[PDB]
CSV table of C-alpha atoms and ligand atoms in Angstrom, one decimal:
chain,number,residue,atom,x,y,z
W,168,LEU,CA,-25.3,-7.6,96.7
W,169,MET,CA,-21.6,-7.7,97.9
W,170,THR,CA,-19.4,-4.7,98.5
W,171,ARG,CA,-19.1,-2.3,95.6
W,172,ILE,CA,-15.8,-2.9,93.7
W,173,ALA,CA,-13.9,0.2,92.4
W,174,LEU,CA,-12.0,-0.6,89.2
W,175,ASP,CA,-8.4,0.5,90.0
W,176,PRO,CA,-7.3,3.0,87.4
W,177,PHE,CA,-3.6,1.9,87.6
W,178,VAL,CA,-4.4,-1.8,87.2
W,179,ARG,CA,-2.1,-2.8,89.9
W,180,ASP,CA,-3.9,-6.2,90.5
W,181,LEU,CA,-6.0,-7.3,87.5
W,182,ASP,CA,-5.9,-11.0,88.5
W,183,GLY,CA,-7.4,-10.2,92.0
W,184,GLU,CA,-10.0,-7.6,90.7
W,185,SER,CA,-11.1,-10.4,88.3
W,186,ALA,CA,-11.4,-12.9,91.1
W,187,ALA,CA,-13.4,-10.4,93.3
W,188,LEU,CA,-15.9,-9.8,90.5
W,189,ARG,CA,-16.1,-13.5,90.0
W,190,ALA,CA,-17.0,-13.8,93.8
W,191,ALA,CA,-19.5,-11.0,93.6
W,192,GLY,CA,-21.2,-12.5,90.6
W,193,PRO,CA,-23.3,-13.1,88.8
W,194,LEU,CA,-24.1,-9.4,88.8
W,195,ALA,CA,-21.8,-7.2,90.8
W,196,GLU,CA,-22.0,-3.6,91.9
W,197,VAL,CA,-19.1,-1.6,90.4
W,198,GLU,CA,-17.7,1.9,90.5
W,199,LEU,CA,-16.0,3.3,87.4
W,200,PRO,CA,-13.4,6.1,87.7
W,201,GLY,CA,-14.9,9.5,88.6
W,202,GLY,CA,-17.2,7.8,91.0
W,203,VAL,CA,-19.7,6.5,88.5
W,204,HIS,CA,-21.9,3.7,89.8
W,205,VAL,CA,-22.8,0.8,87.3
W,206,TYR,CA,-23.3,-2.9,87.5
W,207,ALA,CA,-21.2,-5.7,86.0
W,208,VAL,CA,-21.9,-9.2,84.8
W,209,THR,CA,-19.2,-11.6,85.8
W,210,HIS,CA,-20.4,-15.1,85.1
W,211,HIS,CA,-20.3,-16.9,81.7
W,212,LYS,CA,-23.9,-18.3,81.6
W,213,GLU,CA,-25.5,-15.0,82.6
W,214,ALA,CA,-23.4,-12.8,80.3
W,215,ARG,CA,-24.5,-14.8,77.3
W,216,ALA,CA,-28.1,-14.2,78.4
W,217,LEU,CA,-27.7,-10.4,78.8
W,218,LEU,CA,-25.9,-10.1,75.6
W,219,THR,CA,-28.9,-11.7,73.7
W,220,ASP,CA,-31.7,-9.8,75.7
W,221,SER,CA,-33.4,-7.1,73.6
W,222,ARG,CA,-34.2,-5.3,77.0
W,223,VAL,CA,-30.4,-4.6,77.3
W,224,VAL,CA,-29.5,-1.8,74.9
W,225,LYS,CA,-26.8,0.7,73.8
W,226,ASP,CA,-28.9,3.8,73.7
W,227,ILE,CA,-27.3,6.1,76.3
W,228,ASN,CA,-30.5,8.1,76.5
W,229,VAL,CA,-31.8,5.1,78.5
W,230,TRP,CA,-29.1,5.7,81.3
W,231,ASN,CA,-30.7,7.3,84.4
W,232,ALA,CA,-27.3,8.8,85.3
W,233,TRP,CA,-27.1,10.5,81.8
W,234,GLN,CA,-30.7,11.6,81.6
W,235,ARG,CA,-30.0,13.3,84.9
W,236,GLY,CA,-26.8,15.0,83.4
W,237,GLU,CA,-24.6,13.3,86.2
W,238,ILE,CA,-21.8,12.2,83.8
W,239,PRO,CA,-19.3,15.0,83.4
W,240,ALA,CA,-18.6,16.0,79.7
W,241,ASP,CA,-14.9,16.1,80.8
W,242,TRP,CA,-15.0,12.4,82.0
W,243,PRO,CA,-12.1,10.3,80.9
W,244,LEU,CA,-14.3,7.4,80.0
W,245,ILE,CA,-16.6,9.5,77.9
W,246,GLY,CA,-14.8,8.4,74.7
W,247,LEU,CA,-15.9,4.8,75.2
W,248,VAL,CA,-19.3,5.5,76.7
W,249,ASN,CA,-20.5,8.0,73.9
W,250,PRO,CA,-18.3,7.7,70.8
W,251,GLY,CA,-21.2,8.7,68.5
W,252,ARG,CA,-23.4,6.9,65.9
W,253,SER,CA,-21.8,3.7,64.5
W,254,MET,CA,-22.4,0.0,64.4
W,255,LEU,CA,-21.3,-0.2,68.1
W,256,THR,CA,-23.9,2.1,69.6
W,257,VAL,CA,-27.3,1.1,68.0
W,258,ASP,CA,-29.6,-2.0,67.9
W,259,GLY,CA,-32.0,-4.5,66.2
W,260,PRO,CA,-33.1,-3.4,62.7
W,261,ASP,CA,-31.0,-0.2,62.7
W,262,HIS,CA,-27.8,-2.2,63.5
W,263,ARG,CA,-27.9,-4.7,60.6
W,264,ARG,CA,-27.6,-1.7,58.2
W,265,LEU,CA,-24.3,-0.3,59.5
W,266,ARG,CA,-22.8,-3.8,60.2
W,267,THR,CA,-23.4,-5.6,56.9
W,268,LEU,CA,-20.8,-4.2,54.5
W,269,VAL,CA,-18.2,-4.6,57.3
W,270,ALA,CA,-19.3,-8.2,58.3
W,271,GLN,CA,-19.0,-9.2,54.7
W,272,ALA,CA,-15.5,-7.8,54.2
W,273,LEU,CA,-14.0,-9.7,57.3
W,274,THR,CA,-15.2,-13.3,56.6
W,275,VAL,CA,-12.8,-16.2,56.7
W,276,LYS,CA,-13.0,-16.3,52.9
W,277,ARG,CA,-12.6,-12.5,52.2
W,278,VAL,CA,-9.7,-12.2,54.8
W,279,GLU,CA,-7.7,-15.2,53.6
W,280,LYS,CA,-6.8,-12.9,50.7
W,281,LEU,CA,-4.8,-10.7,53.1
W,282,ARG,CA,-2.5,-13.5,54.2
W,283,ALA,CA,0.1,-12.8,51.5
W,284,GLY,CA,0.2,-9.3,52.9
W,285,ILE,CA,0.5,-10.4,56.6
W,286,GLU,CA,3.2,-12.9,55.9
W,287,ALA,CA,5.0,-10.1,54.0
W,288,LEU,CA,4.9,-7.6,57.0
W,289,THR,CA,5.7,-10.3,59.5
W,290,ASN,CA,8.7,-11.6,57.5
W,291,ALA,CA,9.9,-7.9,57.4
W,292,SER,CA,9.5,-7.2,61.2
W,293,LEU,CA,11.5,-10.3,61.8
W,294,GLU,CA,14.3,-8.8,59.6
W,295,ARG,CA,14.3,-5.7,61.8
W,296,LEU,CA,14.9,-7.8,65.0
W,297,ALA,CA,18.3,-9.5,64.6
W,298,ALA,CA,19.2,-6.2,62.8
W,299,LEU,CA,19.4,-5.1,66.5
W,300,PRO,CA,22.5,-6.0,68.6
W,301,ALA,CA,22.3,-9.5,70.0
W,302,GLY,CA,22.6,-10.1,73.8
W,303,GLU,CA,20.8,-6.9,74.7
W,304,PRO,CA,17.1,-7.1,75.7
W,305,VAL,CA,14.4,-5.9,73.3
W,306,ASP,CA,10.9,-4.7,73.9
W,307,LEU,CA,8.9,-7.2,71.9
W,308,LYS,CA,5.9,-4.9,72.3
W,309,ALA,CA,7.4,-1.8,70.5
W,310,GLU,CA,9.4,-3.7,67.9
W,311,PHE,CA,7.0,-6.5,66.9
W,312,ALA,CA,3.6,-6.6,68.5
W,313,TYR,CA,2.6,-2.9,68.0
W,314,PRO,CA,3.5,-2.1,64.4
W,315,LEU,CA,2.3,-5.3,62.8
W,316,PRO,CA,-1.5,-5.1,63.3
W,317,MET,CA,-1.4,-1.4,62.9
W,318,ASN,CA,0.2,-1.7,59.4
W,319,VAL,CA,-2.4,-4.4,58.6
W,320,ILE,CA,-5.5,-2.6,59.6
W,321,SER,CA,-4.1,0.7,58.0
W,322,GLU,CA,-3.7,-1.3,54.7
W,323,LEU,CA,-7.3,-2.7,55.1
W,324,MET,CA,-8.8,0.9,55.4
W,325,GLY,CA,-6.2,2.5,53.1
W,326,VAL,CA,-4.9,4.8,55.8
W,327,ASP,CA,-1.7,6.7,54.8
W,328,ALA,CA,1.3,5.3,56.7
W,329,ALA,CA,2.8,8.8,57.5
W,330,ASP,CA,0.1,9.3,60.2
W,331,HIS,CA,1.2,6.3,62.3
W,332,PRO,CA,3.5,8.1,64.7
W,333,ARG,CA,0.7,10.7,65.2
W,334,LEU,CA,-1.9,8.0,65.6
W,335,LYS,CA,0.3,6.1,68.2
W,336,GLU,CA,0.7,9.3,70.3
W,337,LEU,CA,-3.1,9.9,70.2
W,338,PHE,CA,-4.3,6.4,71.2
W,339,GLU,CA,-1.8,6.5,74.1
W,340,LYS,CA,-3.8,9.4,75.6
W,341,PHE,CA,-7.3,8.2,74.7
W,342,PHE,CA,-6.9,5.0,76.8
W,343,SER,CA,-5.0,6.4,79.8
W,344,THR,CA,-6.8,6.9,83.0
W,345,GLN,CA,-4.0,9.3,83.9
W,346,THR,CA,-4.6,11.6,81.0
W,347,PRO,CA,-5.5,15.0,82.5
W,348,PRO,CA,-9.3,15.8,82.0
W,349,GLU,CA,-8.5,19.3,80.6
W,350,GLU,CA,-6.4,17.6,77.9
W,351,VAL,CA,-9.4,15.4,76.8
W,352,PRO,CA,-11.2,17.4,74.1
W,353,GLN,CA,-8.1,18.6,72.1
W,354,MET,CA,-7.0,14.9,71.9
W,355,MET,CA,-10.6,14.0,70.6
W,356,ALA,CA,-10.5,17.1,68.4
W,357,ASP,CA,-7.4,16.0,66.6
W,358,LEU,CA,-8.5,12.3,66.2
W,359,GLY,CA,-11.6,13.7,64.4
W,360,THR,CA,-9.6,16.1,62.3
W,361,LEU,CA,-7.1,13.2,61.6
W,362,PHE,CA,-9.8,10.7,60.4
W,363,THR,CA,-11.8,13.4,58.4
W,364,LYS,CA,-8.6,14.4,56.5
W,365,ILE,CA,-7.9,10.8,55.4
W,366,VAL,CA,-11.6,10.2,54.5
W,367,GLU,CA,-11.4,13.1,52.1
W,368,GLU,CA,-8.1,11.7,50.8
W,369,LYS,CA,-10.3,8.7,49.9
W,370,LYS,CA,-13.2,10.6,48.3
W,371,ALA,CA,-10.6,12.4,46.0
W,372,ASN,CA,-8.8,9.2,45.2
W,373,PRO,CA,-11.0,6.0,45.9
W,374,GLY,CA,-8.8,2.8,46.2
W,375,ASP,CA,-9.9,-0.8,46.5
W,376,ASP,CA,-9.6,-0.8,50.4
W,377,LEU,CA,-12.6,-0.9,52.7
W,378,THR,CA,-12.8,2.8,53.4
W,379,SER,CA,-13.7,3.4,49.8
W,380,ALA,CA,-16.0,0.4,49.7
W,381,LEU,CA,-18.1,2.2,52.3
W,382,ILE,CA,-18.2,5.5,50.4
W,383,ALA,CA,-19.4,3.9,47.1
W,384,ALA,CA,-22.4,1.8,48.3
W,385,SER,CA,-24.1,4.4,50.5
W,386,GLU,CA,-24.9,6.5,47.4
W,387,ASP,CA,-27.1,3.7,45.9
W,388,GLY,CA,-29.8,1.5,47.6
W,389,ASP,CA,-28.4,1.5,51.2
W,390,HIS,CA,-27.8,4.0,54.0
W,391,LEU,CA,-24.3,5.3,55.2
W,392,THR,CA,-24.0,9.0,56.2
W,393,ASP,CA,-21.0,11.2,56.0
W,394,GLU,CA,-20.7,10.9,59.8
W,395,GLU,CA,-21.6,7.1,60.0
W,396,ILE,CA,-18.7,6.4,57.7
W,397,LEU,CA,-16.3,8.6,59.8
W,398,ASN,CA,-17.4,7.0,63.0
W,399,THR,CA,-17.4,3.5,61.6
W,400,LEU,CA,-13.8,4.1,60.4
W,401,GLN,CA,-12.5,5.1,63.9
W,402,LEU,CA,-14.2,2.0,65.4
W,403,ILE,CA,-12.4,-0.3,62.9
W,404,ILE,CA,-8.9,1.3,63.4
W,405,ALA,CA,-9.1,1.4,67.2
W,406,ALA,CA,-10.7,-2.0,68.0
W,407,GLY,CA,-8.6,-3.8,65.4
W,408,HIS,CA,-5.1,-2.6,66.5
W,409,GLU,CA,-5.4,-2.3,70.3
W,410,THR,CA,-6.9,-5.7,71.0
W,411,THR,CA,-4.8,-7.8,68.7
W,412,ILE,CA,-1.5,-6.3,69.9
W,413,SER,CA,-2.4,-7.4,73.4
W,414,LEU,CA,-3.4,-10.9,72.2
W,415,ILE,CA,0.1,-11.3,70.8
W,416,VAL,CA,1.9,-10.0,73.9
W,417,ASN,CA,-0.4,-12.0,76.1
W,418,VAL,CA,0.3,-15.2,74.1
W,419,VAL,CA,4.1,-14.6,74.4
W,420,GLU,CA,3.7,-14.0,78.1
W,421,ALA,CA,1.6,-17.2,78.6
W,422,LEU,CA,4.2,-19.4,76.9
W,423,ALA,CA,6.9,-17.9,79.0
W,424,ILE,CA,5.1,-18.7,82.3
W,425,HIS,CA,4.2,-22.3,81.0
W,426,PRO,CA,7.4,-23.6,79.5
W,427,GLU,CA,6.3,-27.3,79.5
W,428,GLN,CA,3.4,-26.3,77.3
W,429,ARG,CA,5.7,-24.0,75.2
W,430,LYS,CA,8.0,-26.9,74.5
W,431,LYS,CA,5.2,-29.0,73.0
W,432,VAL,CA,3.9,-25.9,71.1
W,433,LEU,CA,7.2,-25.3,69.4
W,434,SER,CA,7.5,-29.0,68.4
W,435,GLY,CA,4.0,-29.1,66.7
W,436,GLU,CA,2.4,-31.6,69.3
W,437,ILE,CA,0.0,-28.8,70.2
W,438,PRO,CA,-1.3,-26.8,67.2
W,439,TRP,CA,-1.0,-23.0,67.5
W,440,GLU,CA,-4.7,-22.3,67.0
W,441,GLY,CA,-5.3,-23.8,70.5
W,442,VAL,CA,-2.8,-21.5,72.2
W,443,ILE,CA,-4.4,-18.4,70.8
W,444,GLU,CA,-7.9,-19.5,71.8
W,445,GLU,CA,-6.8,-20.4,75.4
W,446,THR,CA,-5.0,-17.1,75.7
W,447,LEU,CA,-8.3,-15.4,74.8
W,448,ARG,CA,-10.2,-17.2,77.4
W,449,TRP,CA,-7.7,-17.1,80.2
W,450,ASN,CA,-6.2,-13.6,79.7
W,451,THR,CA,-8.4,-11.7,77.3
W,452,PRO,CA,-7.1,-8.5,75.9
W,453,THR,CA,-10.4,-6.7,76.9
W,454,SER,CA,-11.0,-6.8,80.7
W,455,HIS,CA,-14.2,-4.9,80.5
W,456,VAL,CA,-16.6,-3.8,77.7
W,457,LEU,CA,-18.4,-0.6,78.2
W,458,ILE,CA,-21.9,0.0,78.2
W,459,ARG,CA,-25.4,-1.2,77.9
W,460,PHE,CA,-28.5,-0.2,79.8
W,461,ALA,CA,-31.6,-2.0,81.0
W,462,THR,CA,-34.9,-0.8,79.4
W,463,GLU,CA,-36.6,-2.4,82.3
W,464,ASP,CA,-35.7,-4.4,85.4
W,465,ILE,CA,-33.9,-7.7,84.5
W,466,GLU,CA,-33.5,-10.7,86.7
W,467,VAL,CA,-29.9,-11.9,86.8
W,468,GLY,CA,-29.6,-15.1,88.7
W,469,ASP,CA,-30.9,-14.2,92.1
W,470,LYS,CA,-30.4,-10.4,91.7
W,471,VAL,CA,-31.9,-7.6,89.6
W,472,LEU,CA,-30.4,-5.0,87.2
W,473,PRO,CA,-32.6,-2.0,87.9
W,474,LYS,CA,-34.1,-0.2,84.9
W,475,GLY,CA,-31.9,2.6,83.7
W,476,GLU,CA,-28.6,1.5,85.3
W,477,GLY,CA,-25.4,0.9,83.3
W,478,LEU,CA,-24.1,-2.6,82.6
W,479,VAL,CA,-20.5,-3.7,81.9
W,480,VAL,CA,-19.4,-7.1,80.6
W,481,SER,CA,-16.4,-8.2,82.6
W,482,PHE,CA,-14.9,-10.6,80.0
W,483,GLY,CA,-11.7,-10.9,82.0
W,484,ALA,CA,-13.5,-11.9,85.2
W,485,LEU,CA,-15.8,-14.4,83.3
W,486,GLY,CA,-12.9,-15.9,81.2
W,487,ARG,CA,-12.3,-18.2,84.2
W,488,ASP,CA,-15.9,-19.2,85.1
W,489,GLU,CA,-15.5,-22.7,86.7
W,490,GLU,CA,-19.2,-23.3,85.8
W,491,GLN,CA,-18.3,-23.0,82.2
W,492,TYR,CA,-14.8,-24.7,81.9
W,493,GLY,CA,-14.7,-26.9,85.0
W,494,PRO,CA,-12.2,-27.0,87.9
W,495,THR,CA,-9.2,-26.1,85.6
W,496,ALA,CA,-10.8,-22.7,84.6
W,497,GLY,CA,-8.0,-20.9,86.5
W,498,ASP,CA,-5.0,-22.5,84.6
W,499,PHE,CA,-3.7,-22.0,81.1
W,500,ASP,CA,-4.2,-25.3,79.2
W,501,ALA,CA,-3.6,-24.8,75.5
W,502,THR,CA,-5.3,-28.2,74.8
W,503,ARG,CA,-8.6,-27.3,76.6
W,504,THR,CA,-10.5,-28.6,73.7
W,505,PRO,CA,-14.1,-27.8,73.9
W,506,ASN,CA,-13.3,-24.1,74.5
W,507,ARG,CA,-16.4,-21.9,73.7
W,508,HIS,CA,-15.2,-18.7,75.2
W,509,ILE,CA,-16.8,-15.3,74.5
W,510,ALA,CA,-13.7,-13.0,74.4
W,511,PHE,CA,-15.2,-11.8,71.1
W,512,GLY,CA,-18.7,-11.1,72.4
W,513,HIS,CA,-22.2,-12.6,71.9
W,514,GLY,CA,-25.4,-11.9,70.2
W,515,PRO,CA,-25.8,-9.0,67.7
W,516,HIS,CA,-22.6,-7.2,68.5
W,517,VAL,CA,-20.2,-10.1,68.4
W,518,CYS,CA,-16.9,-9.3,66.8
W,519,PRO,CA,-17.0,-9.1,63.0
W,520,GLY,CA,-13.2,-9.1,62.9
W,521,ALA,CA,-12.6,-12.3,64.9
W,522,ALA,CA,-11.2,-14.1,61.9
W,523,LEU,CA,-8.8,-11.3,61.0
W,524,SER,CA,-7.0,-11.3,64.3
W,525,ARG,CA,-7.0,-15.1,64.5
W,526,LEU,CA,-5.3,-14.9,61.2
W,527,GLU,CA,-2.7,-12.1,62.2
W,528,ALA,CA,-1.8,-14.0,65.3
W,529,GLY,CA,-1.7,-17.4,63.6
W,530,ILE,CA,0.8,-16.1,61.1
W,531,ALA,CA,2.9,-13.9,63.3
W,532,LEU,CA,3.5,-16.0,66.5
W,533,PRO,CA,4.7,-19.2,64.8
W,534,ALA,CA,6.9,-17.0,62.5
W,535,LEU,CA,8.6,-15.4,65.5
W,536,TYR,CA,9.3,-18.7,67.3
W,537,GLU,CA,10.5,-20.3,64.0
W,538,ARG,CA,13.1,-17.5,63.7
W,539,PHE,CA,13.9,-17.2,67.5
W,540,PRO,CA,13.2,-20.6,69.1
W,541,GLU,CA,15.0,-19.7,72.3
W,542,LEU,CA,13.1,-16.5,72.9
W,543,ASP,CA,12.1,-15.9,76.6
W,544,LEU,CA,11.5,-13.1,79.0
W,545,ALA,CA,14.3,-10.7,79.9
W,546,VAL,CA,12.7,-10.0,83.4
W,547,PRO,CA,11.0,-12.2,85.9
W,548,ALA,CA,7.4,-12.9,84.9
W,549,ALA,CA,6.1,-11.0,88.0
W,550,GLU,CA,7.8,-7.7,87.1
W,551,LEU,CA,5.7,-7.3,83.9
W,552,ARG,CA,2.9,-4.8,84.5
W,553,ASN,CA,-0.4,-3.5,83.2
W,554,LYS,CA,-0.6,0.0,81.7
W,555,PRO,CA,-3.2,2.3,83.4
W,556,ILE,CA,-6.2,1.4,81.2
W,557,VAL,CA,-9.2,0.2,83.1
W,558,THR,CA,-11.0,-1.6,80.3
W,559,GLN,CA,-7.9,-3.2,78.7
W,560,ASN,CA,-5.4,-5.8,79.6
W,561,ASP,CA,-2.3,-4.1,78.2
W,562,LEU,CA,1.3,-4.5,79.3
W,563,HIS,CA,3.7,-1.7,79.5
W,564,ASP,CA,6.5,-3.4,77.7
W,565,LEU,CA,7.5,-7.0,77.0
W,566,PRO,CA,11.3,-7.2,77.3
W,567,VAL,CA,12.8,-10.4,75.9
W,568,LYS,CA,16.1,-11.9,74.9
W,569,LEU,CA,15.6,-13.3,71.4
W,570,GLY,CA,18.4,-15.9,71.6
W,571,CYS,CA,20.0,-16.3,68.2
W,572,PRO,CA,18.1,-17.1,65.0
W,573,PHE,CA,17.6,-20.7,63.8
W,574,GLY,CA,15.8,-19.4,60.7
N,1580,LIG,C1,-8.2,-10.1,70.0
N,1580,LIG,C2,-8.9,-9.3,69.2
N,1580,LIG,C3,-10.2,-8.8,69.5
N,1580,LIG,C4,-11.1,-8.9,70.6
N,1580,LIG,C5,-10.8,-9.6,71.9
N,1580,LIG,C6,-12.3,-8.3,70.2
N,1580,LIG,C7,-13.4,-8.2,71.1
N,1580,LIG,C8,-14.5,-7.7,70.8
N,1580,LIG,C9,-15.7,-7.6,71.7
N,1580,LIG,C10,-15.9,-8.2,73.0
N,1580,LIG,C11,-16.6,-7.0,71.0
N,1580,LIG,C12,-18.0,-6.7,71.4
N,1580,LIG,C13,-18.4,-5.3,71.8
N,1580,LIG,C14,-19.7,-5.3,72.6
N,1580,LIG,O1,-20.4,-6.4,72.6
N,1580,LIG,O2,-20.1,-4.4,73.3
N,1580,LIG,C15,-16.1,-6.6,69.7
N,1580,LIG,C16,-16.8,-5.9,68.8
N,1580,LIG,C17,-16.2,-5.4,67.6
N,1580,LIG,N1,-15.0,-5.7,67.2
N,1580,LIG,FE1,-13.7,-6.8,68.0
N,1580,LIG,N2,-12.2,-7.8,69.0
N,1580,LIG,C18,-11.0,-8.1,68.5
N,1580,LIG,C19,-10.5,-7.7,67.2
N,1580,LIG,C20,-11.2,-6.9,66.3
N,1580,LIG,C21,-10.7,-6.7,65.0
N,1580,LIG,C22,-9.4,-7.2,64.3
N,1580,LIG,C23,-11.7,-5.8,64.4
N,1580,LIG,C24,-11.8,-5.2,63.0
N,1580,LIG,C25,-11.0,-5.5,62.0
N,1580,LIG,C26,-12.6,-5.6,65.4
N,1580,LIG,C27,-13.8,-4.9,65.2
N,1580,LIG,C28,-14.9,-5.0,66.0
N,1580,LIG,C29,-16.1,-4.2,65.7
N,1580,LIG,C30,-16.3,-3.4,64.5
N,1580,LIG,C31,-16.9,-4.5,66.7
N,1580,LIG,C32,-18.3,-3.9,66.8
N,1580,LIG,C33,-19.4,-4.8,66.2
N,1580,LIG,C34,-20.8,-4.6,66.6
N,1580,LIG,O3,-21.1,-3.7,67.5
N,1580,LIG,O4,-21.7,-5.2,66.0
N,1580,LIG,N3,-12.3,-6.3,66.5
N,1580,LIG,N4,-14.8,-7.0,69.6
N,1581,LIG,C1,-15.0,3.2,71.1
N,1581,LIG,C2,-14.0,2.7,70.1
N,1581,LIG,C3,-14.7,1.6,69.3
N,1581,LIG,C4,-15.0,0.4,70.2
N,1581,LIG,C5,-13.7,-0.2,70.8
N,1581,LIG,C6,-13.0,0.9,71.6
N,1581,LIG,C7,-11.7,0.3,72.1
N,1581,LIG,C8,-12.0,-0.7,73.1
N,1581,LIG,C9,-12.7,-1.9,72.4
N,1581,LIG,C10,-12.3,-3.1,72.6
N,1581,LIG,C11,-13.1,-4.3,72.3
N,1581,LIG,O1,-12.9,-5.4,72.6
N,1581,LIG,C12,-14.4,-4.0,71.5
N,1581,LIG,C13,-14.3,-2.7,70.8
N,1581,LIG,C14,-13.9,-1.5,71.7
N,1581,LIG,C15,-15.1,-1.3,72.7
N,1581,LIG,C16,-12.7,2.1,70.6
N,1581,LIG,C17,-12.1,3.4,71.2
N,1581,LIG,C18,-12.3,4.4,70.1
N,1581,LIG,C19,-13.4,3.8,69.2
N,1581,LIG,O2,-14.4,4.8,68.7
């Protein structure tokens, strides 16, 4: 086993961390912030295997370190490691019960119906740009990427829009490695009190949206506790806004660095669905997914994940496995045709909202470059920088000069 790798909480060099984990694969020793030792799978072939192995589980009571009360309650990463009972944290027969009404609501068919809505919100956001003074840089993150998927997923769950500025300011702190440990459990307090408030707004006045579809259904021949709903709602609002925002940003960043490919994208030669997929492989929004545990020793290539130890899937590292995609695994090629990446997961927990975000991004990007065909970065590509979020590949801002609307 190669030298232990300590995930930098300031994300000063993601591309090199990823390469190191690549080198230390298939299974690498890793240290999470606060000195917590866990292992990490960093190869494509082997990550598929562990994700479909029933010996690898989400029950934290299987974690040696947690049995032995070694994980501070004040830990910054506790939010991710132990978020409570939901689809995310259980397995096998118990899992299917919490997933099913959510997996049905986000199929290609049942999400096609939201398109009208997404075109609406995009075509608006575009109006608000250009409404800004031309010539002067704009943060494409704050003005376009952030609000769009939030609005969407708010609509989907029927969340009141007057809680947006408050939800923004809370998720900011949840993800930051530089949020002060004494501040943790009044942030989590207020998330809980925020989500409980709007769940009761829904019981009082049930709408057609998915929050209410969970409420009515539980009462008859299937499951769903008062807590399981509340936890399953946080999961859907968090996962479904964070990741997709980053996808959009990252697509825009990729086309900037690769302008020959951008030229062909804008002309139609390369279809947009190939750019979005390649961006997911090459520069996934989710660098690391937290937390599984071996029920017993598992062979992993020529190493062993010892029974009781934590496991991380390093999607960022494995997104450029040359064993999987050949010698060009390190480069953005939007035409890379057979492209069976796992940015969305594998086995039982694989993303149920893949089709939603593929849809949001496949509407919003071509809309933006139809309106602003000259749009390029306002800063050199190397000055762009990751926010301090160890699991996520999030940029701080994306300043661009729009360059006059040919819409
Ligand atoms: C670019 C966008 C996205 C990426 C890269 C992404 C990635 C992932 C990954 C890797 C997982 C697996 C978690 C694990 O195996 O431990 C996952 C699970 C999940 N994602 Fe996504 N996701 C995206 C968008 C969304 C959206 C839009 C929604 C909801 C509308 C969503 C909801 C979920 C849920 C509910 C789970 C848990 C499913 C389960 O545990 O069975 N995600 N996502
Ligand atoms: C844990 C969590 C649900 C699961 C989310 C997590 C944000 C990070 C994230 C990104 C993914 O790619 C999968 C879903 C996860 C792992 C969310 C933060 C709050 C919410 O309860």
